[PDB]
């Protein structure tokens with residue numbers, strides 16, 4: 174009469190409560206594998222993410238502990254919330270895996286980027302991105318690593334963020350996606366709230382261009398990509414850079430950088446209607462303000478919420494045994 178039951182989805186086995194039914198794998202992530210499921214008690218479809226051995230790696234333990242506490246303490250329409258968290262194990266010594274259950278989203282943000290989008294839906298998704306980020310900054314947390322895959326979207330166009338961002342050796346085949354990190358992050362510079370606006374910029378720019386704006390195998394490669402299109406930073410930005418970092422940047426060959434109408438041509442935006450001609454004007458303008466290498470020139474989230482394109486929609490270190498106990502107490506208050 175165990176309330177849990179074990180099923181194998183993908184290679185790994187999933188042990189879940191009886192309430193969850195017809196498990197199917199929607200995706201796989203480093204922290205854990207995710208399955209779509211139906212809740213007999215809820216009568217609604219849900220997504221279940223399995224964290225296996227979050228305690229085995231200190232980096233995994235810090236992320237796992239932070240995710241559990243944050244999903245509970247913070248609740249926002251644009252931030253994914255956990256409906257339930259369970260572990261099949263019955264004691265602290267037996268505990269090995271943690272299962273997080275949340276609301277099932279229809280698609281990933283990457284998929285939305287691929288389709289050709291209308292300004293209203295685009296401005297709405299971006300608006301929601303700023304709202305969640307604004308809530309995060311209100312909570313004192315700066316994501317610093319917004320990525321399309323971490324942003325889930327629904328058929329009705331509602332957008333939700335999956336993770337709370339960076340807080341570091343890990344030993345796996347999975348590779349981080351750094352395309353959407355800001356220059357202050359790429360150059361290890363000291364950050365601020367509007368470090369996430371750059372990520373929103375890379376995303377908004379990828380929706381228009383339908384390609385990753387600054388894709389690079391390494392931070393150096395990516396920094397070359399950012400300076401080519403954007404242009405070499407100003408001297409004031411250099412003075413802000415530490416000397417060892419400043420030397421590298423100034424040694425980089427200088428690029429004049431394309432112009433934003435040249436970066437995002439008028440053709441990429443729809444020109445069918447006067448309203449769409451104006452929207453593209455408002456869109457290209459917002460892009461120019463968000464994709465700014467210097468954070469002092471970059472636009473604030475609030476000002477981006479005020480922007481006409483966006484405005485219309487508005488109405489610690491522990492031992493692995495210590496980490497296991499910390500995570501276990503989070504699973505069971």
Ligand SMILES: CC(C)(C)n1cc(-c2ccnc(NCCCNS(=O)(=O)c3ccc(O)cc3)c2)c(-c2cccc(O)c2)n1
Pocket residue numbers: 198199200201202203204205206207209220222275276277278279280281282284321322323325326335336
């Ligand atoms: C990192 C972690 C573990 C926190 N995480 C949490 C989630 C998560 C949470 C809530 N809802 C979702 N579902 C919508 C996107 C799924 N992709 S889908 O192939 O289009 C698809 C959609 C519906 C379907 O029935 C069959 C396939 C995902 C993901 C995740 C999984 C796959 C891709 C991805 O980008 C992210 N990762």
